[PDB]
Design a protein around this ligand. Sequence first.
Ligand SMILES: *S(=O)(=O)c1ccccc1COc1cccc2nc(N)nc(N)c12
Lengths: 288, 287
Amino acid sequence: VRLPFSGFRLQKVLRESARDKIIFLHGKVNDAVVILEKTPFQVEQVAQLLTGSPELQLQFSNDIYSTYHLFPPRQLNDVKTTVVYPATEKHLQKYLRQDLRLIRETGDDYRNITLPHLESQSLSIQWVYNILDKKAEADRIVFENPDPSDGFVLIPDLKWNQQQLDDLYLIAICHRRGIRSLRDLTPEHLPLLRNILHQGQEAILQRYRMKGDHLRVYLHYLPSYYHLHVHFTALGFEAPGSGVERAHLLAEVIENLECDPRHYQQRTLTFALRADDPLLKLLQEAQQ
Amino acid sequence: VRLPFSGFRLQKVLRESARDKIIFLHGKVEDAVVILEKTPFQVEQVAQLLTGSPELQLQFSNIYSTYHLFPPRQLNDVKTTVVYPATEKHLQKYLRQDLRLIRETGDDYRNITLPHLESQSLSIQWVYNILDKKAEADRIVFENPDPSDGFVLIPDLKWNQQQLDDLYLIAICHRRGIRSLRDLTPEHLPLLRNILHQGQEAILQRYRMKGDHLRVYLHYLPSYYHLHVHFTALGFEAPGSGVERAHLLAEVIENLECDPRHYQQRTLTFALRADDPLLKLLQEAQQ
Ligand SMILES: *S(=O)(=O)c1ccccc1COc1cccc2nc(N)nc(N)c12
């Protein structure tokens, strides 16, 4: 009926999703986290309401189209409230949403700024190697082309529970070492890229009875780890990562290499970086 | 004030996404379509409420505890869009149908897509009304009146303007006949550069929002065949910002600067509803 705490004091807005009509608030009480979510429309109540004279405020009118502001009764004004008390730093860590900034990296920016910066860090990818040499997740391999050069391993994502095709999420990791990202791609990688695309899709079809036209097959520019990997997701499954600011379709990557051999070494790639990322400042400094 | 219709009579629920807190309703008023969307939370208006004793109803408890909050009139806003009159193709537009992917080669566009498109597509009168100031004149954020390289920057209908979190603006070109990405050649470079640059500088002036906070893109297979550029807040997982439809303006320009014949010759990838006749046409053509 009431708050499990005496007084709230908003310290920071952890995360918010304007799309999902949700807010995540960190507050010092008497530390507590309060989640507020707008409720989905109930078909019946909404129908019932619209079939009666409501309180409307015409925003604008344009031809057959018109927008309004509706104020419905108490029933249709429900708000989902979740309270986390007490909440530690690790509790805030999971709901921490960093401000993203966009950057346009040219080939020279990559060569001079990006490449030396990532070379300075020792991002270990031993977990990747363990997958490839079957020391880990061997039981999860859906398909494998063992070719040391043009070969790959198709494993389903760990976040995917495999109990439905609606959220089908698979990842192809190439056997060959040294292809850190999209920037390392040249026409010599075409047989490997064509296998990941063709062999991967044919494996999804055989195993999961899922046609290629139901699949979104892409690469990430500025990937989470620097050993080439391609994502196979169900088309109906929408998620950050499948967005234009990061995803690059494999079919398109292949066709670019077929047209311009030097494409990914010379062309300007667009991606997002966290505001606090040192690489962001480095590129901004370089571009002025 | 009153609705534009003589009562409502729900015939079919076109779409209902519990995730997006939105409903699409078809009703006989004559035919009318009513879209209802829950509004995103306004940081201040919510911070004003929580610092005051509210009406809560405890659902569950464990560190976790769920409640039911009933806020005042202000925080109870609902975005209402009314389409009156609405056609059969208008009803088809909001139906939850399975999506299929297609890779359209230059020749597929010329032979299949272009003639299909030419057979008929939507009335774009609302677009024309914006351009000739017959509608939404008070909403224009910037205008370059050049008949050829000019445009109009306006907040899109899908944005309530009460927060920057979901900033969605659209730039519509003044020039008629550029239906889509396929019509683009180097002659359109001044127009495209003008949208990219002037559009971003208008967002900066009006909304104090830097370009690095913006995602600027085109849609392949657009809903309206009159060239338009979307300006969205990067943090917003905007509808159609996905790789299977969105094409960054900066990239569209650079492609034209490199290959003049790029969009006439290259193979474009997009999704279509399973029930769409264009989908069958292209599938039939590709075998
Ligand atoms: S319709 O064209 O299918 C449609 C359906 C639902 C919502 C919007 C639209 C088309 O968009 C608009 C219609 C009328 C006016 C308008 N004005 C602005 N500023 N933006 C948009 N997006 C529209």
